[PDB]
Design a protein around this ligand. Structure first.
Ligand SMILES: Nc1ncnc2c1ncn2[C@@H]1O[C@H](COP(=O)(O)O)[C@@H](O)[C@H]1O
Ligand SMILES: Nc1ncnc2c1ncn2[C@@H]1O[C@H](COP(=O)(O)O)[C@@H](O)[C@H]1O
Ligand SMILES: Nc1ncnc2c1ncn2[C@@H]1O[C@H](COP(=O)(O)O)[C@@H](O)[C@H]1O
Ligand SMILES: O=P(O)(O)OC[C@H]1O[C@H](OP(=O)(O)O)[C@H](O)[C@@H]1O
Ligand SMILES: O=P(O)(O)OC[C@H]1O[C@H](OP(=O)(O)O)[C@H](O)[C@@H]1O
Ligand SMILES: [K+]
Ligand SMILES: [K+]
Ligand SMILES: [K+]
Ligand SMILES: [K+]
Ligand SMILES: [K+]
Ligand SMILES: [K+]
Lengths: 322, 322, 322, 322, 322, 322
């Protein structure tokens, strides 16, 4: 198959986390299949079908934990597959793909703004919010509360190994919002002064569990200890279909040198392993609500979100498979 | 008034954290008064006395949180005051200061060894152990349990902002102990494979609370959630006497440039604050045992230690005072 | 603009709490629009419509917390709006308002009876039951369980500041049920002899939280500490729709003279504030079941009730609005 | 009135626990109905109808706690009844009974196989599983996981008084799975080495509570204590529809001779009562997931299984009733 | 025996709670025995011995729950008894009693001031303190923090049935301290804004339990839920000797009409009992510290306080017994 | 080397559990030492000394977990050793052994009687008590309470594998106390009707943990869950001095034939391991009080029992050692 440059560049940048955030990763995965359909030089429908099959697979094997990525691919290729199997001609396939792909990106953008408006109603004036990592959705909520004229301060946790909290601190601060930057270790110490916790999701499971950035479960734990509300801002495509039939989510182990730089680690003894999980799993009992673009749920209603939007596809194979 | 440079240098190095760890800071300050005494050029007792008080004030105003420091100073200066007020001559006073400092240092070393001997009995063949920061007393326990031929593995938390875990990791490796190095955030995620938790203490309070490196309380919190024993390895001079009469322990707020380096921090907007507590406080309900040189205690028995060894001095002002 | 006195009197009495309890307030407001419609002197639909909206605004601005009230108003006014905008003539509109109000009142009465029938099955012969405030729906359950020949005894909390428990106590006694009357403070002390807890609800939220009379959350808290079932007896019109899209329920702050009578309160210094929340919020983790007219649910299933019966109206403004 | 031998045998074998396990009981009840219809000497529809009614009551009045039994009888008799009231002739009605029984029996075996497939995905290589009693659904999960190449070990609790664990241990051993057998008392002692708990259910209620063999709640409680996942393997016919309308599940109290043999018990004093509850009730807060043949649910979603598969029948009487 | 007027007046006023507060009750009990020794017209030592024996018994049978009362009597009569048994003449007995009695009252007064100074060190500037009932000792702590220039607000709970909170609110407010008065039911609702809880004791037990005003355990419970420190301000004579040898403290049941006034209650049905426990028992795990006049303890160190100050007397009969 | 028959019998009877219960074991060990001295044919002091050393080792190497045994041997052999090193002649040394054994045996019986007296005060009229295994100290508490006229009922858990509960039930029945006998699995089912839990101890550690019959921790855990008091009835020789210096108590693993009889076990597959821990370890957070003959303590005061009664011996070797 004749895969375009942009499909491979996008895959590289997902692996390397130059492109990161589960929402963004997913939009970018959709963008890539769109560009493959723009520039494809294929003559028949069945050539193009095959390019998009292979482009999808390239994109799926980049980073495993955020289901947002495969839900973007599925959004485009369920539609592309249906077109092809009902004998769409070539230009009818090229459009299905381009259009499905634009549908997903626009609905993503709209969902986040909507999550912002909903979640902000749960923020009270004077609140001190503690967040983790960098999440566009969590930030939509905090940003929207500030624009409503609520006076808020956000406690940004640093989020090692990759320092995501620096992006968050600068982002919120540039909107006018006062920020307090602290280390991940200081989360319990400042939980007493915290009124709310607002964080993202990479995968939400059937039973209510949230996979998000490493350290998320600690903040959640001690939030429960102190009765601070834990609010997970998360789009419906963060919800994980395969968990309905009993799959556990893969937790991405990233390279040791994101923790200890190569120049430093090569000097350390052989009997020190460095372990770099990218994500942990927060149980549902530590979660007050999940703010989706369709509204507030208890985390145990994740099963409904999946029943009604995703369940149907589980009897079929994946839409990029032979 | 005529204070030697070794006192001034010890101070500077305690502040900058070139000299660090509660016990070592204590030994360094004992040592500093020793050198003041050896090298003093005083002719009268009153003149040496005055040097020994001023040197004590300089050493005590360095770092507040770890009570080891003022306890070392008191061990020396109670004995210096008793001698001076009982009419000691110049050389009897100089030797009282010197010999007292030596007793403190010697007892500090013996206590850490004995703590290791005692704590090691609570480590079992096969144990995965999680620790935090760098604690001589904690390491002593792990080192001895290995030396007894137990096959242990230690999970070492990175301990930001100052990366104390690097020190711990390299040291444990160097005695032959396999290490797993993780970010602080990952402590709950790895608590399910952990069997024991073993950390140090900077100050231990009347009611059993352990003030220790920032993040300690999170590790204990989730340790307890999981039923993993939390064991604090701690010398009797870590116990805090002022807290018998209601005093709260000051928590050191250290320079923000330790968190975010100067060169970068000055590029950030005014409306980000960086906050950097060097310690947090862990409740007694989350501690299984404290391991002192005199044996295993439940945390609530902190008060006995304080009664029988320290309470006598609480009717009197500090032995360095005018 | 030409509003009858029955609407004005119903309002005044809802405010003063002469008419009180979530369900009864709802029925009183349905009834108030009914009388507005029966007695209206309008010639045009537009003129009646306008009376029905203004009367609705007057009734809704009385007391905020209990969602029963605006739910009753909507039951009537959704149907009035649909008729008016579909071109109904004066008398078709008047009858739509009147007949809708009647359906609400009739359904309210049937629901409380059925709730009693359902809840009673969860009461067992011999049960000591603790309750709080005065709730029709809660009493219905206790009354029916007695009527079935179960030998129950009810602990009745006094419920300050308004002494709601006196009402509950006299009423339960009058059906033949032995009562034990205690101050609110004594609820933990008597929780060890309690078998069941049965209380009402003013608003139930998207995530399962029950807003109810002040003190409810304490009784549930210690009920849970003790493993005593907490059962909330509540009509579907107690469920709060705005909370699907992030709205927090306002908690009524009532006059301080209800706490400390006027004559006494004016003798007190300026620097005492009296604060008087009429409700508190009980988390879903402390609730065993909610008992509605449609059956037993776990609290987290609040969201289903809200979805299938109320969410449809959340794209539209209130049916009383200009 | 003309009930075949086979029905009376099934009933006796169910009461004496010669046939046992919730699913197998249900399959035996349907088998009996199937054999009543096959061998019936009834001449008219109304005569067969009456034999089946009576068979169904004989069967329902054997053992109360496991609802799998009445759900089997309902499955058949709902269909048999809908035929009879439509005016179905004799051989038409005999086939509704015969075929509905076979549908139930086949779907049962299919459901359990699929529970195995789904629940096995939650077992990870290396896992140690604690189980309780003898559940065919739980065993399917453990068997499948092992067949996938996962090296697991199973802690089989003995399950007094009927010694069920001996059956589970022998069985699992017979597939090549290493079993650790321990007494019920030791569940907490070994919870620290358990990774996963997997058990059956006799009845699952509307709020998520699980009724299973006596002991089950203790194992769930200490599992929650230690953060081990509790996974309930349960066919959808284990869910209890009467609970939707407030019913409490009856806890079968069986003979004291199953605890203390007749020989020994008769010598004991009169003032020793021997109580033998066959089941207990685990709350949903201690259950991570229910594995059904339609998927994984959080325990709070039990109410949906019921709304959507059994809720329709609650306005009618039992099908075997007049 | 010729008991003076003031012994009987004091007993009456303890029963009626005209004199109340455990410290005050005890000082007043001591005052009474003092006055009996002032005014006694007795000729021999053995007459006087007998008057004080009988005066003590009159005072002991007034209110049972606060051990402060009998510890005051014991303080005077251990001394009086020792005098008499070593053959003190009459004036030597009259003084022992008068003087012992003044010793107790002065040490009481001094202990409270000292509890104020200790406990205030645990109060931080800006703190919002929630209290219960009226306790001189709790107030000493809060009063002393305010005089130190810490800016504090106190949340006074009303404390039914007897309204103690009115005395507290007026008292604190008259010292300049801002007060918030709320009902006992509002304790959890305002626990989120509370930094510290400071309360009294009537009896502290060997194992750490605090008997204090009804409702105390609820505030403590929800304080633990929210991680607010519960500090019990309490003199060493609040500690309960008989608990060392396994006695449970009697919980005083006061007359129903303190709850519902006589004019009102006489009209209520016969099947309503009104239950008025004066006190409840807070377990030690909900208590952070006990501030005694000898300093801060964990509640589990109550056994030490009793071992060293009280243990010795338990092998002897009570000092007012024949 | 010349060890009498009686010592070898005691040892065998201890290993096979023909003599059992921690106290009774200890009394049997001292009895053996007493009989070794009485019947000794030794001519010199050093010869008797040597028989006693060897007897003590034979006895100590029977069963490890219950420390009552080594504390008995220590009581005697500390005294026997202090005599021998003072130069005591033969008949002087024989009497130290004989008399020290009798001192221990008499004080044991006295301690248990006094535990009964003390612990009975915590039983209230009406109480239902759950117990576990067969403890003479626990039984003393239940017997005394009943003898005081309190109408109690006792839930006797069966205590597999050795069926201890049958002994407890028969015994208690024999004093006229109504017993409910239940299997271990049912402890949580009946915890809701239990008012009080009362059990023994084999070893009590320095931090308060209680080692008792397998199952004990499950009963403590579900008791804590339901706020039932857990009361441990334990002689002061149950406290474990090695634990002061970090030692962990060994958990005796006994024969698999005590779980599954030899006849049956030999037929089973090789791939079923049967594990029989005889004890488990209850944490101090789940224990309300330890009832000793010197009084009630909170479990955290165990360290004082030890400091003040056994702490002296830890700098020396065992008395029976060379
Ligand atoms: N890898 C995973 N995939 C899906 N769900 C998980 C995974 N790990 C944990 N969970 C769920 O998330 C929660 C975390 O529980 P625990 O592991 O006990 O903290 C539980 O509900 C688990 O069932
Ligand atoms: N600065 C401090 N000095 C002494 N004790 C403290 C300090 N801060 C907290 N504590 C104690 O440590 C524990 C921490 O409580 P929490 O507020 O639950 O983290 C409590 O037991 C307090 O008594
Ligand atoms: N005003 C409110 N409106 C709606 N939900 C609320 C409100 N206040 C609290 N909650 C919810 O109710 C529960 C109370 O939480 P806590 O703050 O633990 O008492 C949480 O589940 C919140 O989601
Ligand atoms: O989709 P949004 O809300 O922006 O963020 C969702 C989550 O995905 C991210 O992972 P990574 O940085 O890609 O590894 C972060 O963990 C974040 O909370
Ligand atoms: O001794 P002080 O600290 O003043 O108060 C101690 C306690 O005694 C009181 O009881 P009551 O009003 O006599 O029934 C209150 O409960 C108060 O907390
Ligand atoms: K907070
Ligand atoms: K673990
Ligand atoms: K109860
Ligand atoms: K585990
Ligand atoms: K707070
Ligand atoms: K109970």
């Amino acid at each position: 198959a004749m895969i375009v440059k942009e499909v491979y560049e996008t895959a590289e940048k997902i692996k390397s986390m130059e492109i990161r955030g589960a929402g963004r990763i997913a939009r970018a995965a959709a963008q890539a299949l769109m560009i493959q359909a723009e520039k494809s030089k294929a003559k028949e429908p069945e050539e193009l079908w095959n390019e998009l099959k292979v482009a999808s697979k390239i994109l799926y094997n980049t980073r495993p934990t955020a289901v947002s990525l495969p839900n973007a691919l599925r959004y485009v290729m369920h539609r592309v597959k249906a077109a092809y199997l009902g004998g769409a001609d070539l230009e009818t396939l090229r459009f299905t793909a381009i259009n499905s792909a634009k549908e997903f990106i626009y609905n993503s953008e709209k969902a986040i703004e909507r999550i912002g408006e909903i979640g902000a109603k749960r923020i009270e004036d004077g609140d001190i919010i503690m967040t983790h990592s960098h999440s566009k959705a969590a930030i939509s909520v905090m940003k929207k509360a500030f624009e409503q004229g609520k006076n808020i301060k956000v406690i940004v946790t640093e989020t090692r190994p990759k320092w995501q909290g620096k992006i968050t601190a600068k982002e919120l601060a540039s909107y006018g919002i006062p920020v307090i930057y602290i280390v991940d270790s200081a989360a319990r110490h400042y939980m007493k002064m915290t009124d709310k916790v607002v964080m993202g999701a990479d995968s939400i499971t059937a039973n209510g569990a949230v996979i998000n950035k490493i350290g998320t479960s600690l903040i959640a734990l001690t939030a429960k200890e102190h009765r601070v509300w834990v609010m997970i801002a998360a789009e419906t495509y963060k919800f994980h279909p395969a968990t309905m039939l009993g799959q556990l989510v893969e937790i991405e182990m990233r390279d040791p040198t994101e923790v200890i730089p190569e120049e430093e680690l090569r000097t350390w003894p052989k009997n020190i392993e460095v372990w770099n999980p990218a994500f942990d799993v927060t149980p549902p009992e530590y979660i007050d609500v999940i703010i989706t673009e369709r509204g507030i749920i208890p985390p145990y209603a994740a099963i409904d979100i999946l029943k009604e939007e995703f369940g149907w596809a589980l009897k079929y194979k994946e839409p990029w498979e032979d």
